[PDB]
């Protein structure tokens, strides 16, 4: 009870032992009573201050330890605790960047339909203030029109911690779209098109795509193979299904007598 509030978080967190103790702290809290009814009772809202705070510190530990399924696991239950039905609940000041962690994460795995339907819950924090939520929606605005490069240039400006586990997957799922645009049957380009389209004057990334894909620098020339289909068509070969399609016409005219 009242177990290790700021033991190995405020200074440094390289440990997994207190992560097992936070697991034991999860065993203590979710065996206190419950969180399901929440009828009144500010006294049982007292541990609701505690339970949200210890999952905030579990969320900070989850992104620090580079863990994908568990980060959304704790964040959902955090969102379930802002799904409180009887919400007196004085404002825990970590909420807005906590949503911005999820809002940037769920942009990164291309849940764009889930991106915009999450944005409904904020009345005026999107526009008036709150750079933590303003950063992904300005980012998602930059993905809209034509603006790839402003994403890669405004990477180096974060109000919070560096968001590194989000943005590198986020840029990597932009690189394959540029790749999937340039992996077409348009045959050959040069290394300067790699700098313009792909990115990066002479990187290790040109060695990356040399070993992952082809695109090998020959006599100052990249070779992308033809991704062109063959199109074997007769299109009278819908002859059985077309002869079938005529039959249920005359069937449905008749047969009800």
């Amino acid at each position: 009870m009242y177990e290790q509030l700021k033991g190995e978080w405020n200074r440094k967190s390289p440990n997994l032992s207190k992560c097992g103790e936070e697991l034991g702290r999860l065993k203590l809290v979710l065996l206190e009573l419950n969180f399901l009814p929440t009828t009144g009772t500010k006294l049982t809202k007292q541990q609701l201050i505690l339970a949200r705070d210890i999952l905030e510190i579990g969320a900070q530990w989850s992104i620090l330890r580079k863990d994908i399924p568990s980060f959304e696991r704790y964040m959902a239950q955090l969102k379930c605790y802002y799904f409180d039905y009887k919400e007196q609940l004085p404002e825990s000041a970590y909420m807005h960047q906590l949503l911005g962690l999820n809002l940037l994460f769920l942009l990164s795995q291309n849940r764009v339909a889930e991106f915009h339907t999450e944005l409904e819950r904020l009345p005026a924090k999107d526009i008036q203030t709150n750079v933590y939520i303003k950063h992904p929606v300005s980012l998602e605005q930059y993905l809209m029109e034509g603006s790839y490069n402003k994403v890669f240039l405004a990477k180096g400006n974060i109000p919070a911690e560096s968001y590194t586990f989000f943005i590198d997957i986020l840029l990597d799922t932009i690189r394959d779209e540029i790749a999937g645009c340039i992996e077409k049957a348009y045959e050959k380009i040069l290394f300067t098109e790699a700098t313009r389209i792909l990115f990066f004057n002479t990187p290790k990334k040109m060695t990356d795509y040399a070993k992952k894909r082809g695109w090998v620098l020959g006599p100052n020339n990249y070779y992308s193979f033809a991704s062109q289909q063959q199109k074997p068509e007769d299109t009278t070969i819908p002859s059985t299904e077309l002869a079938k399609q005529v039959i249920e016409y005359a069937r449905q005219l008749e047969m009800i007598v």
């Binding site: 007769d234 009278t236 077309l242 016409y249």
Partner: protein, 65 residues
């Protein structure tokens, strides 16, 4: 039953060039090349068959629809 006799005539001409080509009875020569031009007379599918068929299947279809 117009088509049930199509293979019925064909199952007879099936069995003839089974039992004459297998090696039982002496071959006629007249019936062989008189069968040969049949196989070099069936139509095939082409682009001229293609665009024409949907030109007039649609035209038959419009009256129904």
């Amino acid at each position: 039953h117009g088509l049930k006799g199509l293979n019925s005539k064909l199952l007879d001409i099936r069995s003839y060039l089974e039992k004459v080509a297998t090696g039982k009875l002496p071959i006629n020569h007249q019936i062989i090349y008189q069968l040969q031009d049949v196989f070099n007379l069936l139509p095939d599918v082409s682009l001229q068959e293609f665009v024409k068929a949907f030109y007039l299947k649609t035209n038959d279809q419009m009256v129904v629809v």
